[PDB]
Amino acid sequence: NLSKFCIDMTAMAREGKIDPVIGREEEIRRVIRILSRRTKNNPVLIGEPGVGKTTIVEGLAQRIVNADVPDNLAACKLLSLDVGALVAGSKYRGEFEERMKGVLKEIQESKETIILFVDEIHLLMGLKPMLARGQLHCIGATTLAEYRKYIEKDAAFERRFQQVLVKEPSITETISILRGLKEKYEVHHGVNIADAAIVAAANLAARYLTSRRLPDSAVDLIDEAAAAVRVARESQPEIIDSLERRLRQLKIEIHALSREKDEASKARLAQAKQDAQNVEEELRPLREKYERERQRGKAIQEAKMKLEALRVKAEDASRMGDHSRAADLQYYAIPEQEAIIKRLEAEKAAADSMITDVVGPDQINEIVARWTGIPVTRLKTSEKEKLLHMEQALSKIVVGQKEAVQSVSNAIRLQRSGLSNPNQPPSFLFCGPSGTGKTLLTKALAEFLFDDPKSMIRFDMSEYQERHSLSRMIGAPPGYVGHDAGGQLTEALRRRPFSILLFDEVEKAAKEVLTVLLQLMDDGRITDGQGRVVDAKNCIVVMTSNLGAEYLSRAIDPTTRELVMNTLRNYFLPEFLNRISSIVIFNRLTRREIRKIVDLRIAEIQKRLTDNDRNVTIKVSDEAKDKLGAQGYSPVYGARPLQRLLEKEVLNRLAILILRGQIREGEVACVELVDGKVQVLPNHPD
Amino acid sequence: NLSKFCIDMTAMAREGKIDPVIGREEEIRRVIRILSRRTKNNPVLIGEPGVGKTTIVEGLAQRIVNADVPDNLAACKLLSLDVGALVAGSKYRGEFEERMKGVLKEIQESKETIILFVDEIHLLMGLKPMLARGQLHCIGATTLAEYRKYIEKDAAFERRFQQVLVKEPSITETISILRGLKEKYEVHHGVNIADAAIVAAANLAARYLTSRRLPDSAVDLIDEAAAAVRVARESQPEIIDSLERRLRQLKIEIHALSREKDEASKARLAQAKQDAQNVEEELRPLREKYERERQRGKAIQEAKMKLEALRVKAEDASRMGDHSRAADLQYYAIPEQEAIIKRLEAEKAAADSMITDVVGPDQINEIVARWTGIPVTRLKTSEKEKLLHMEQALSKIVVGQKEAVQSVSNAIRLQRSGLSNPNQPPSFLFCGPSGTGKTLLTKALAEFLFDDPKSMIRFDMSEYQERHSLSRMIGAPPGYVGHDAGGQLTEALRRRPFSILLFDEVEKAAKEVLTVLLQLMDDGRITDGQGRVVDAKNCIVVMTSNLGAEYLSRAIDPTTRELVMNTLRNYFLPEFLNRISSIVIFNRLTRREIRKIVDLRIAEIQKRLTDNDRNVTIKVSDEAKDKLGAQGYSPVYGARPLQRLLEKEVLNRLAILILRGQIREGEVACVELVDGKVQVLPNHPD
Amino acid sequence: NLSKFCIDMTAMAREGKIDPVIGREEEIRRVIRILSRRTKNNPVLIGEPGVGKTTIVEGLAQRIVNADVPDNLAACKLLSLDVGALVAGSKYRGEFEERMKGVLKEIQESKETIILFVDEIHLLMGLKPMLARGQLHCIGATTLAEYRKYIEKDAAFERRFQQVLVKEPSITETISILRGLKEKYEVHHGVNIADAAIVAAANLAARYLTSRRLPDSAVDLIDEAAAAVRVARESMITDVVGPDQINEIVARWTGIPVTRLKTSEKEKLLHMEQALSKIVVGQKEAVQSVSNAIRLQRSGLSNPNQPPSFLFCGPSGTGKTLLTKALAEFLFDDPKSMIRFDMSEYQERHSLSRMIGAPPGYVGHDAGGQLTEALRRRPFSILLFDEVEKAAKEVLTVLLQLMDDGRITDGQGRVVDAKNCIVVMTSNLGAEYLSRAIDPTTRELVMNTLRNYFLPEFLNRISSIVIFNRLTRREIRKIVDLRIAEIQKRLTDNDRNVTIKVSDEAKDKLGAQGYSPVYGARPLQRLLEKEVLNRLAILILRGQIREGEVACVELVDGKVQVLPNHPD
């Protein structure tokens, strides 16, 4: 028989080597209905890669072999066969097609109803399975795109098929499947785990390592964690290996002195004999407890092995009816094995590097850290304390609208508390003069709430005032030219959902993209031109304005607030306008805060000084700062100009004397001013 | 036992036949972890060609042989693959399929857990060993390119592997691992090397030999140094070999004197032969000293080899139960023989005005010059001396915009200072009239900085207002031509990391090309059609405009500069014009500096004259240059027409007179403006 | 012992059967260095056919035999199999590989230090001793191309090797190499030669026979000299070799009088106007202009890497085509040295692929490179291009990137040499501004209407700026007289002898007639030819105008007609 390429699922099912599936049953029954459906028997599943749609097929087969299934299909069997393996048969398609017809017939001339799951089904593209008229069955599963690319472009084949979707499970579903496979994996490493670590780890992978999808992601996370900790238990303790290297060098010394004959040699001979003694009679306690734990875990492993083997054999026999041996094996070998395990556990509990075989969340934390280099500190923060401190925290970054800060704070608070629409994320639309750090405000926001620069994006609506600009920016359905670039916005949502959304020049926008953004607000997602309606619940969305700022006199009054109220209600649909978290405003910039910013400026300057060993002592006279500020305020950009202004107007002469070294190590940057012109004074000429 | 293709690494390990390896350890530990995992034991590596990926594998094996790996690995046998051998078997799948299975089968025939690392794994893709998970075990390694080409195609492998890239090592790490090597390398060629020399050498290769990567390159450099040494000797001493050069010259004397048939010739032949005897009597003592000391070195290294032999012998003896034999060997045979070899070393060191024969920075520098041909003095100036004297040398090329010289100089300082943005490369937008040498300015600038014409590249947005042009300028996904040739910027940055980047007439650019350039300004690198990023921190950029010509009317005035600033604000983004390093400004030329650059031209001319045999001085009348300038000042195109003007005007008649016979050598080109046209006074008639 | 396939160079070294070329020592040093490369001992030499880098390895063997080598290499036996020596005894690749193993067994047998060489060593790819860790030593050489084709593929091999470029030998160095060979060959034949004549010969082989390669080509020359001798001396007294015989042979391979070769190339320079006048007439200004330009070229005072270039503005054939011709046949002394190129077909972007090439996987790239093989086979030549302004802008781009640098990339992936080329663009985009008469305005008008067409600096890398005119009626008649002269020549070619008597009346008639504002009267050449050849041959095959009998080419009643001397 040419079962060469085939793999009998039902075999391992009876064998029980297949992993125990969990959850997602209604889908299974849907599959069933599709099978017994006459017109198009074809279950053709679709989902994102890696999710182990495979796992789902196998779980259905598992449910099958228990015979609690469609009767007309209970007598049927399932098996896999890699299409790549079939085309691995030969090099050329011609001789290959002989193998293929062999496949189609070999199953055809099979007097027992058995079905094949054609994984990666689309690869039929590269046909013969027009033989499908009920005499046979298949099972389809592959990604959406290529399905639309080839299957959707074949009527006859497809009018005989029925797309099946795959929802991506959520946190709780992880919790389920992970708690399930916990025992299996712990055995395969002979280890222990606690739950809260699993919970966190799941959430964490969900948050940051997101180039892949739930849930197998957090699974392999568990994997690597357990591997690392199992490597540590498998490895000798640091005291043990140091002891052993020591004693090796100790017997080295002992005998090297046994060669020489002089009183010092014999002295350190006896001394190194005592050394090797001490170390050996100390290690053999620790050495032997290490060995004992090795043996304990060993016995544990093999006991679980025979335990589950008996379990699967007994389940098989019960499915058969071999009652006598089934019952005796069950109520004899299971209980004694339980006793074995419980006395093993008792002795391990009494055993008190002695590492806790149980893993810890901190472990996963370190792992994800080296996965993304992100400071471990920020991770172990539950996203709650930061909330109870974010307000003043970000105040410590920029100042100027305490009220705006605390407002957006309350907004995100009400989001995370879950006291609103749980699907439409909070939305933001600013107004006021640039220079404050509005951008920078959002920036600190992100790197505090997602802890990443790239978490920010940028959108400037002059670039988005043509309807076709909208088209390209959201991408177009594959039937259009936008198929080669797609939607940068959309694709950004894809790659990193937990991120931030900037929008600017919104006054200069096209009305249509304005409306699709309004939808996004009320949608919490966007129906792409392709069908992948990608969530936004992990997003933050900001729009910019500076128009009414012409009202801003240095001074907060409600009067001007209503001024710009109308000044905006005119601009956009008041219903649309009802979709901000709350109206976001600004104000003028009194001198005091500006010179405070100057203090922050000289601060980051001293920071740059600290970046290297160079001690430099910035002495900004009060009046220095005073002139700096009083000069560089921009009625159009505030200190954004003044920033680089002072940057130049110090860094120049600073680096001058630095290159010159005339102001030497440990010296003082006496930041001086000369008659209305700032001039730091060199401690010396050449 | 098809060991025809089995090739063990642990063997050469067991004889120290591969040197130790430094750093990279956390990598190894990660690899171990992955090998332990239950999901996809087989990890994958990504890095630059042959950069020591192999070294990581073999060093892991080294760790193995000396009892640090865990038990599962303590039971591992590991080896490399006759990959190319099976690629070289037969051009059709055929029998190397079958031999491949045989060894694959031969794998199953295993006492302990056999591990087969494989490189180039793409070679099997462009599926056969899809048979047994758990039986076989490899490690993955190739180029990221190959990763996406074949790794990411077969979903099976995609679930069956996990990648671990390889960051490029850094310079200090180079220094360390090179000390390590240095030990064994000198042992191979018995000549000492200044550590600091090696440090230089590494930095040098890093700065210029971008063909390969760090550190292998600088390794080869040290090797070239050892080579230059061993060839300054001839398996000899080096001063002995230079006296052998002198002795070969003495033999030339001997033969050229036997050539002459007289008595004094034979007498001075005997003189040369006595000199030959004396150079021999000094040749010998130090030559046999050299032979003896290299024999002493092999004594040392074979003593260390036996040391490793007995060490690992005591290791696998405690594994078997015979640690006493190798124990005693280490105890007694090792220290005493090592001591007597050290005694031979001390006595030969005692056998040692004065003369040097060990490596120094000089020879390294000379070799790198020979490799690139750059002057040794140019290498050794250091990014410090030029900063103290650049402005001078630059003025030695063109002048007039002294302010801008100063400015760009401070900018380069800032970079080298590091006090500025530690990553943002410098950036300067040229503004002024063409026809002075803005181009020339930047040219000589670079050739003073990196000392390379080709270190400069020029770009003009005239062919960039299109999308496909942006693509070609950066590249594209494979379904395009942008993949072919990639992008000019990225390909250049690769081909030369240190450079300057001209973008002339940028005011005509497509604003999305402007966007990618702005990224370059603010990334330190760039994301491409392949997504990969290449650092430009060690690079700078150039872009020019010529709008201000409106305001161009000589007297430096500020009022115009803000007009220009807004003129370009309306052309680009505000922050874009702020993410720059500094604004650039130009102007017209003073008639005096005009005449000056003309004097420089005629200097070039007389230089070209003394290049050939024509020593014809030129009496360029004041009127000559005055009229030439009055003509050649093109208010449209500066004086970039002027040199051509003057050469067409005079140089032609010059060469004409010189060759037609109107000039004999050594003459004076007494050239004089006569009636609006400069006609040199005929030095000799037709 | 299957050491037959290799050859112990060190043996003939001991037997002294070897004669070292000299120079290139530094390269041999490089070799030694890599022979000390503990990492990749095996280098790879790279050069060109004829240079017989075999020479180089033999010289290394020389430095072996006299014990003048690094002793780490003292006992090394240097032998070299031929890959062909194994292509012969091969009933199949297995048997090929069989003998491979067999010798390699003897080879891998580590008796003493031994080093191998293989010519065309790339051929081993298309290998078996990939087993070679470097415990052994080898060396080889080939062209860059197949090296990149085969050795670039494997990581292992390519890494184990070191690419070394032999480089082109200096002309002065070749004379020194000839010297060292002189006595040897003379012994081989019993002859003597003047060193200076030999130097001449060298320079000649340089200027021609580019098919071959120095210096071994110049050797071949000297061998031919010795041959002529071994004829003569054995057929006062004739015993030595003058330049004469060299000249005989260079002629026998080019068909040119020694006169045109015994030149020193200065008088021709000083008298190009003479020849031109005797060929072309009507643009004396451009004549002297280009003369001084190419002089400056040869003067050395020119830019060392700026080959010439000459603007054309005037009708076609008027002499300018004939000009280009004379330029070739007088400077480089070959008609075919001109390679036309109609830019009218190069107004397309794909014409870049069609001319120089494009990325290798295209259809036009194979047509490309027309300049590449041209220069490789013809260094001393000229590059004609017609109405270039219409040609595609990337075509003009690559043409510029040639003319400035005297070198340009190709679609194949290389930058050819052009240090003996001449740039030629030709059109009459503003010639219609003119009459039969010179006014600088119309001249300056064309100046503008052409400098506009591109970067005027693109025109300002041209060696000059040159126009043409509409010939004067009198010099029109002059070139007419030239024509009728070559026609009477053609008459004298065959024994039928008849006197062309072109009346000044018929002269004016034909001239003015064929004079047209398009090409002047170049088609009139064929027109008047029809007018004469027809009638003269009519009377030739009729028996009217016999030998010597006059051909009064006379204009009768506004229609030129030769009066039939004797009616039928």
In three state form, how does the secondary structure of A250-287 look?
HHHHHHHHHHCCCHHHHHHHHHHHHHHHHHHHHHHHHH
- Residues from A contacting B (CB-CB < 8 Å) are 49-50, 82, 84-85, 88, 91, 120, 185, 188-189, 219-220, 223-224, 227-228, 230-231, 234-235, 241, 248, 251-252, 255-256, 258-259, 484, 608-609, 611-612, 637, 640, 644, 648, 651-652, 654-656, 658-659
Residue C313, burial from CB neighbour count under 10 angstroms (0-12, 13-18, 19+)? buried
Domain ranges of chain C: 6-165, 260-467, 473-562
CATH 3.40.190.10, applies to C260-467: no
State whether residue B504 is helix, strand or coil: strand
Contact residues, chain B, for C32 at CB < 8 Å: 231
Whole-number Å distance between alpha carbons of B56 and B62 = 10
Any idea which fold A591-680 has? Answer: Helicase, Ruva Protein; domain 3 (1.10.8)
How far does A93 lie from chain B, in Å, by closest CA? 15
* Pick among B27, B28, B34, B37 to test the A interface (most A CBs inside 10 A): B37
From B482, which residue of chain C is nearest by alpha-carbon distance?
Answer: C359
Tell me the two tokens of residue C133. Answer: 């860790």
- DSSP character at residue C554: E
How far does B158 lie from chain A, in Å, by closest CA? 9
Type and span of the H or E element at B646: helix B642-646
Q: Do chains B and C touch (3 or more CB pairs under 8 A)?
A: yes
* Contact residues for B231 (Cβ-Cβ < 8 A; gap 6+): C29, C32, C33, C36, C70
Residue C310, burial from CB neighbour count under 10 angstroms (0-12, 13-18, 19+)? buried
Contact residues, chain C, for B640 at CB < 8 Å: 457
From A120, which residue of chain B is nearest by alpha-carbon distance?
Answer: B155
Contact C70 B233 (CB under 8 A): yes
Residue of C127, C159, C296 with shortest CB distance to B88: C127
C9, C18 contact by CB (below 8 A) = yes
Instruction: Give the technique used to solve this structure.
Output: cryo-EM
Paired strand residues for B136 = B133
Neighbouring CB atoms inside 10 A of B675's CB total: 6
Query: Which subunits sit against A, judged by 3+ Cβ pairs under 8 A?
Result: B
How far does B353 lie from chain C, in Å, by closest CA? 27
Contact B127 A219 (CB under 8 A): no
* Pick among B417, B514, B565, B577 to test the A interface (most A CBs inside 10 A): B417
Contact residues, chain A, for B36 at CB < 8 Å: 227, 230-231
Whole-number Å distance between alpha carbons of B615 and B619 = 13
**What's the distance, CA A113 to chain centroid?**
43
From B414, which residue of chain A is nearest by alpha-carbon distance?
Answer: A655
Residue B529 CB-half CA count within 13 A: 25
Whole-number Å distance between alpha carbons of B395 and B406 = 11
Contact C39 B659 (CB under 8 A): no
Contact residues, chain B, for A644 at CB < 8 Å: 578
Q: Do chains B and A touch (3 or more CB pairs under 8 A)?
A: yes
Contact C70 B614 (CB under 8 A): no
Type and span of the H or E element at C555: strand C550-556
Q: Could you tell me the CA-to-CA distances from C309 to C291, C395, C397 in Å, in that order?
A: 12, 17, 15
Q: Phi and psi (nearest 5°) for B350?
A: -65, -40
Whole-number Å distance between alpha carbons of A262 and A260 = 6
Whole-number Å distance between alpha carbons of A300 and C121 = 62
Whole-number Å distance between alpha carbons of A541 and A518 = 11
Residue of A84, A223, A484 with shortest CB distance to B37: A223
Contact B33 A234 (CB under 8 A): no
Buried b (16+ CB within 10 A) or exposed e, B625-635: bbbbbeebbee
From C129, which residue of chain B is nearest by alpha-carbon distance?
Answer: B85
Q: Of C428, C532, C450, C417, which Cα lies nearest the Cα of C484?
A: C532
Q: Could you tell me the CA-to-CA distances from B439 to B508, C350, C404 in Å, in that order?
A: 18, 32, 17
β-bridge pairing C140-142 and C44-46: parallel
Q: What is the dihedral of CA C343, C344, C346, C349, to 10 degrees?
A: 140
Residue of B70, B327, B574 with shortest CB distance to A255: B327
Type and span of the H or E element at A119: strand A114-119
Any idea which fold A378-585 has? Answer: Rossmann fold (3.40.50)
- DSSP character at residue A5: S
Q: Could you tell me the CA-to-CA distances from C145 to A290, B514, C120 in Å, in that order?
A: 64, 40, 12
A226, A360 contact by CB (below 8 A) = no
**Length in residues, chain B:** 686
From C290, which residue of chain B is nearest by alpha-carbon distance?
Answer: B652
Contact residues, chain B, for C404 at CB < 8 Å: none
Paired strand residues for B669 = B618
* Contact residues for C496 (Cβ-Cβ < 8 A; gap 6+): C540, C547
Tell me chain B's radius of gyration from C-alpha atoms: 35
Residue with tokens 């088209």, as numbered in its chain? A471
How far does B67 lie from chain A, in Å, by closest CA? 10
Residue C57 CB-half CA count within 13 A: 25
Q: Could you tell me the CA-to-CA distances from C486 to C318, C322, C335, C478, C481 in Å, in that order?
A: 17, 14, 18, 13, 9
A412, A582 contact by CB (below 8 A) = no
Q: Of C308, C402, C409, which Cα lies nearest the Cα of C368?
A: C409
Tell me chain A's radius of gyration from C-alpha atoms: 35
* Total CB pairs under 8 A between chain B and C: 81
Whole-number Å distance between alpha carbons of B265 and B253 = 10
Tell me chain C's radius of gyration from C-alpha atoms: 32
Residue of B223, B485, B659 with shortest CB distance to C295: B659
Q: Of B39, B211, B53, which Cα lies nearest the Cα of B146?
A: B53
- DSSP character at residue C169: P
Type and span of the H or E element at A141: strand A138-142
How far does C285 lie from chain B, in Å, by closest CA? 14
Degrees, nearest 5: CA angle C99-C102-C106: 140
Contact B236 C70 (CB under 8 A): yes
Class of domain C6-165: alpha beta
Buried b (16+ CB within 10 A) or exposed e, C125-144: beeebbebeeebbbbbbbee
* Contact residues for B118 (Cβ-Cβ < 8 A; gap 6+): B80, B81, B83, B138, B139, B140
A21, A62 contact by CB (below 8 A) = yes
What are the contacts of C284-292 at 24+ separation with CB within 8 A? Answer: C285/C466, C286/C310, C286/C323, C286/C466, C286/C467, C286/C468, C289/C464, C289/C466, C290/C327, C290/C464, C290/C466, C292/B652, C292/B655, C292/B656
Type and span of the H or E element at C144: helix C144-150
Whole-number Å distance between alpha carbons of A348 and A344 = 6
**DSSP secondary structure string, C318-367?**
SSHHHHHHHHIIIII--GGGEE--BGGG-SSTHHHHHHT--SSSSSSTTT
What are the contacts of C475-480 at 24+ separation with CB within 8 A? Answer: C475/C281, C475/C282, C476/C511, C476/C512, C476/C515, C476/C520, C476/C521, C477/C504, C477/C507, C477/C508, C477/C511, C478/C281, C479/C281, C479/C282, C479/C319, C480/C507, C480/C510, C480/C511, C480/C528
Whole-number Å distance between alpha carbons of B2 and C132 = 20
Paired strand residues for A500 = none
Residue A388, burial from CB neighbour count under 10 angstroms (0-12, 13-18, 19+)? exposed
The terminus-to-terminus CA distance of chain C in angstroms comes to 94
Residue C532, burial from CB neighbour count under 10 angstroms (0-12, 13-18, 19+)? buried
Breaks (C-N over 2.5 A) in chain B follow: 126, 352, 555
Whole-number Å distance between alpha carbons of A439 and A444 = 9
A238, B43 contact by CB (below 8 A) = no
β-bridge pairing B673-674 and B677-678: antiparallel
B678, B672 contact by CB (below 8 A) = yes
The sign one gets for the Cα dihedral B665, B666, B670, B671 is positive
β-bridge pairing A534-535 and A525-526: antiparallel
Q: Of B55, B63, B65, B15, which Cα lies nearest the Cα of B139?
A: B55
Tell me the two tokens of residue C398. Answer: 């690559």
Contact residues, chain C, for B45 at CB < 8 Å: none
Whole-number Å distance between alpha carbons of B300 and B284 = 24
Phi-psi group of C224: left, alpha or beta (phi > 0 → left; psi -120 to 50 → alpha; rest → beta): alpha
Paired strand residues for A429 = A543
Whole-number Å distance between alpha carbons of B190 and B204 = 24
CATH of C473-562, one of 3.40.50.970, 3.40.50.1220, 2.40.240.20, 1.10.8.60: 1.10.8.60
Whole-number Å distance between alpha carbons of B387 and B391 = 8
Strands (E), B295-445: 427-431
- Residues from C contacting B (CB-CB < 8 Å) are 29, 32-34, 36-39, 68-74, 127-128, 130, 154-156, 159, 269-270, 292, 295-296, 299-302, 359, 457, 460
State whether residue A51 is helix, strand or coil: coil
**What's the distance, CA A433 to chain centroid?**
37
Sheet containing C338-339: order of strands? C309-313, C423-427, C382-386, C338-339
From A219, which residue of chain B is nearest by alpha-carbon distance?
Answer: B39
From A462, which residue of chain B is nearest by alpha-carbon distance?
Answer: B573
What are the contacts of A646-653 at 24+ separation with CB within 8 A? Answer: A646/A598, A646/A601, A648/B582, A649/A678, A650/A605, A650/A678, A650/A680, A651/B414, A651/B419, A651/B420, A652/B410, A653/A679, A653/A680, A653/A682
Whole-number Å distance between alpha carbons of B632 and B627 = 8
From B386, which residue of chain A is nearest by alpha-carbon distance?
Answer: A659
Strands (E), C34-121: 44-46, 77-80, 114-119
Contact B328 A255 (CB under 8 A): yes
* Pick among C30, C36, C289, C305 to test the B interface (most B CBs inside 10 A): C36
Strands (E), C161-218: 163-165, 192-193
Domain C6-165 and domain C260-467 have a common topology = yes
Degrees, nearest 5: CA angle B69-B70-B71: 130
Q: Of A678, A683, A589, A681, which Cα lies nearest the Cα of A625?
A: A678
State whether residue B583 is helix, strand or coil: strand
Whole-number Å distance between alpha carbons of B236 and C69 = 10
Contact B484 C270 (CB under 8 A): no
Contact residues, chain B, for C70 at CB < 8 Å: 230-231, 233-236
Query: Which subunits sit against B, judged by 3+ Cβ pairs under 8 A?
Result: A, C
Whole-number Å distance between alpha carbons of B194 and B362 = 11
The terminus-to-terminus CA distance of chain B in angstroms comes to 94
* Pick among A244, A280, A659 to test the B interface (most B CBs inside 10 A): A659
**B39: amino acid identity, one letter:** T
How far does B149 lie from chain C, in Å, by closest CA? 17
Whole-number Å distance between alpha carbons of A204 and C82 = 66
From C127, which residue of chain B is nearest by alpha-carbon distance?
Answer: B88
The terminus-to-terminus CA distance of chain A in angstroms comes to 94
* Helix, strand, coil % over all residues of chain C, rounded to 5: 50, 10, 40
Contact B659 C299 (CB under 8 A): yes
β-bridge pairing C140-142 and A77-81: unpaired
Residue A157, burial from CB neighbour count under 10 angstroms (0-12, 13-18, 19+)? middle
Contact B231 C32 (CB under 8 A): yes
State whether residue B599 is helix, strand or coil: helix
Strands (E), A562-676: 619-620, 670-671, 673-674
